[PDB]
Amino acid sequence: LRPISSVVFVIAMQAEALPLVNKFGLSETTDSPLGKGLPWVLYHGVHKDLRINVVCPGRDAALGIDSVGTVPASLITFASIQALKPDIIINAGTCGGFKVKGANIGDVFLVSDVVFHDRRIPIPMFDLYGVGLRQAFSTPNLLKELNLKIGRLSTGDSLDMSTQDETLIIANDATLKDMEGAAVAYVADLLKIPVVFLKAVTDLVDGDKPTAEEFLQNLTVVTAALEGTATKVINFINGRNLSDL
Amino acid sequence: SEILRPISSVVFVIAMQAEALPLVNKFGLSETTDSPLGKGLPWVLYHGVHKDLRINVVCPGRDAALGIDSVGTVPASLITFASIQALKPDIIINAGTCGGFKVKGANIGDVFLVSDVVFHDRRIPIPMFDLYGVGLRQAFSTPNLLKELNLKIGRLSTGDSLDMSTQDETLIIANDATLKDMEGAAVAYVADLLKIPVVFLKAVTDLVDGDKPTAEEFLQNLTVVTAALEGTATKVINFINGRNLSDL
Numbered sequence: 001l002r003p004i005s006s007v008v009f010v011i012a013m014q015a016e017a018l019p020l021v022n023k024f025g026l027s028e029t030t031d032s033p034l035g036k037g038l039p040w041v042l043y044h045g046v047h048k049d050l051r052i053n054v055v056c057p058g059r060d061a062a063l064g065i066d067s068v069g070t071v072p073a074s075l076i077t078f079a080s081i082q083a084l085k086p087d088i089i090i091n092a093g094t095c096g097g098f099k100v101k102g103a104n105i106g107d108v109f110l111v112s113d114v115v116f117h118d119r120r121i122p123i124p125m126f127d128l129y130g131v132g133l134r135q136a137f138s139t140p141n142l143l144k145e146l147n148l149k150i151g152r153l154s155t156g157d158s159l160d161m162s163t164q165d166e167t168l169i170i171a172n173d174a175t176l177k178d179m180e181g182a183a184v185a186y187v188a189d190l191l192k193i194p195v196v197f198l199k200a201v202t203d204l205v206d207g208d209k210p211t212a213e214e215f216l217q218n219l220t221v222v223t224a225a226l227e228g229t230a231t232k233v234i235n236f237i238n239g240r241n242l243s244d245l
Numbered sequence: 246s247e248i249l250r251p252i253s254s255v256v257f258v259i260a261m262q263a264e265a266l267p268l269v270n271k272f273g274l275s276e277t278t279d280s281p282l283g284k285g286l287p288w289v290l291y292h293g294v295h296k297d298l299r300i301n302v303v304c305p306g307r308d309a310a311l312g313i314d315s316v317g318t319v320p321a322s323l324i325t326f327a328s329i330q331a332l333k334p335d336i337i338i339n340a341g342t343c344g345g346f347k348v349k350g351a352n353i354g355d356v357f358l359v360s361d362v363v364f365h366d367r368r369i370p371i372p373m374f375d376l377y378g379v380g381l382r383q384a385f386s387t388p389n390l391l392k393e394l395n396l397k398i399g400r401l402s403t404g405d406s407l408d409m410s411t412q413d414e415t416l417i418i419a420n421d422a423t424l425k426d427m428e429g430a431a432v433a434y435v436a437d438l439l440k441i442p443v444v445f446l447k448a449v450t451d452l453v454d455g456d457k458p459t460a461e462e463f464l465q466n467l468t469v470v471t472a473a474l475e476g477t478a479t480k481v482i483n484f485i486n487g488r489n490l491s492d493l
């Protein structure tokens with residue numbers, strides 16, 4: 001009955017956030033509400049029955065690059081939920097895709113469920129824990145109306161892929177590969193907040209181009225594709241309750 | 246405007262509750278009940294006082310789905326972050342059992358004072374992201390503690406897998422680590438962000454490059470090495486009491 005009134009986006013790279021920030025005329029938060037001295041970046045605004053916040057892990061103090069990976073994504077997810085109390089979290093970002101699973105460069109995917117491929121604990125019941133299978137929040141009307149591809153996401157802290165990473169990714173029949181998604185899901189689960197994922201394919205994992213080269217090659221164009229979908233997602237959510245999608 | 250004075254509190258971050266209990270029992274710490282780190286969470290906080298020092302012990306506690314300790318970097322980073330913001334420690338101590346390399350001088354039962362920490366499972370083959378993924382961070386300098394306790398020293402390497410792949414081993418060898426665990430580097434990352442001094446006590450329960458233990462060996466090492474960790478942690482607590490950060 002209660003319509004959604006607050007959405008938080010978790011975005012690992014500032015360059016990925018800006019197109020969205022601009023589209024909705026969000027402004028950069030200036031008062032460090034999640035903690036003094038942190039590198040994190042927050043953008044806030046209202047549109048129109050929705051509060052919108054976009055949080056980023058920010059840059060490494062020493063090295064200057066975006067603080068990608070599961071640990072920072074978990075912290076900002078935790079901190080933003082506790083400060084802002086959103087109705088729903090959306091982790092938006094780029095990812096690798098498998099052509100064999102129907103993924104094409106530029107595709108923006110909704111996520112059915114998520115796993116980790118780099119948390120291997122070979123004791124029964126710890127094994128399941130490491131893999132961390134979690135379902136994204138059910139959004140069938142959004143899926144239908146926006147006509148998005150959907151598949152399983154597999155997460156780990158490496159941009160390349162080890163043999164053992166591949167083994168787990170395949171065993172879990174993942175379509176998509178990223179560096180934050182399963183950890184955002186773990187935190188959303190822990191704090192009982194619906195989570196949805198938008199994952200935009202920059203590189204083909206089963207393809208013939210090197211991962212880092214292809215990722216970097218397509219980042220800009222694919223991020224604009226990600227913006228277009230995230231914009232339609234916000235517009236759809238507005239005025240709806242969680243049951244509506 | 247700021248005059249420096251003795252440390253007033255410490256928080257221990259301990260991944261597995263069984264590792265924490267002997268320290269809790271030794272100092273008669275009480276398990277808190279007023280949700281100090283947030284309502285509706287499985288995290289456990291123990292609180293007490295030893296002489297002039299306030300002692301907080303934080304554990305990620307049991308996983309809702311499966312009921313096991315919530316091991317690994319993500320939960321460790323969360324409880325570290327939340328306990329710093331709520332509890333305002335002067336210093337954080339990541340204490341726990343870990344794997345070791347006999348080729349690097351480690352033995353079963355040794356409790357190491359970690360010099361510095363890295364990740365072995367954050368591989369990002371792009372300039373400046375590569376270094377970021379490795380995440381090299383120095384532990385807080387504690388020379389007088391080391392003169393007193395004479396713990397072995399070594400680099401710690403962290404990742405979310407309990408086993409070791411060849412890819413894992415390659416980074417661990419490249420980074421010249423003596424110790425292998427599942428939380429330390431992530432604890433250091435959070436400690437760094439919030440500018441809190443961090444120390445690590447890492448007790449070798451298994452030799453990553455040594456012969457497989459027997460059953461009676463496995464269990465014995467688990468009792469005796471956890472007891473060794475408690476004995477060392479107790480000595481650190483008695484040592485830190487009444488000291489400024491600069492005296493250690």
Ligand SMILES: Nc1ncnc2c([C@@H]3O[C@H](CO)[C@@H](O)[C@H]3O)n[nH]c12
Nearest residue numbers: 012068094095096159177178179180
């Ligand atoms: N093939 C791939 N593997 C893992 N992550 C990514 C990404 C995403 O882009 C960032 C790369 O550090 C990170 O946020 C990750 O989630 N794009 N392509 C990927």
Ligand SMILES: Nc1ncnc2[nH]cnc12
Nearest residue numbers: 342343344407425426427
């Ligand atoms: N061998 C090992 N590797 C990683 N984490 C551990 N924790 C305890 N023993 C370990």
